[PDB]
């Protein structure tokens, strides 16, 4: 990776038709209206910092039965927006985290009446020694995790 690792590109299916790339060097990558966010997406519906993606070192206890990747890094999508975001098929409320597998489509905002729909396609171009870039490691079937003060602190420095 020369600078880019993950590519979040607001696809045509979404009200936004732009492409943003999370530099492997920037952790965590903040997205939202405010330019402060590593990613620039301004939607009156979402907060200046609707959500941010944070990368963490993927690990596990033993390798009994299951075959892990020793100890590589994975990308976690953190949502801090009050309008709640949607990752593929999992709910993302203000204060949640989710595993990002190469080719992850995340919905920042969806309005049935307003027809306001946002969605970015995550595409890992470079693999900075990733357990498997992001194919959806077994064990945990796409489940939404919760964030702690550690996560909230990340945005505090934003």
């Amino acid at each position: 990776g020369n600078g880019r690792f993950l590519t979040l590109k607001p696809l045509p299916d979404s009200i936004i038709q732009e492409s943003l790339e999370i530099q492997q060097g920037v952790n965590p990558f903040f997205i939202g209206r405010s330019e402060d966010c590593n990613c620039k997406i301004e939607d009156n519906r979402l907060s200046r910092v609707h959500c941010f993606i944070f990368k963490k070192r993927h690990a596990v206890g033993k390798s009994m039965y299951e075959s892990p990747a020793q100890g590589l890094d994975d990308i976690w999508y953190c949502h801090t927006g009050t309008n709640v975001s949607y990752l593929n098929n999992n709910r993302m409320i203000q204060g949640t985290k989710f595993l990002l597998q190469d080719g992850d489509e995340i919905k920042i905002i969806w309005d049935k009446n307003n027809k306001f729909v946002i969605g970015f396609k995550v595409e890992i171009n470079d693999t900075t020694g990733l357990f498997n870039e992001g194919l959806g490691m077994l064990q945990e079937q796409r489940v939404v995790l919760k964030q702690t003060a550690e996560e909230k602190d990340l945005v505090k420095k934003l």
């Binding site: 519906r45 907060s47 009050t82 309008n83 969806w110």
Partner: peptide
């Protein structure tokens, strides 16, 4: 300082 609710 925010009042959002997409329902």
């Amino acid at each position: 300082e925010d009042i959002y609710y997409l329902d």
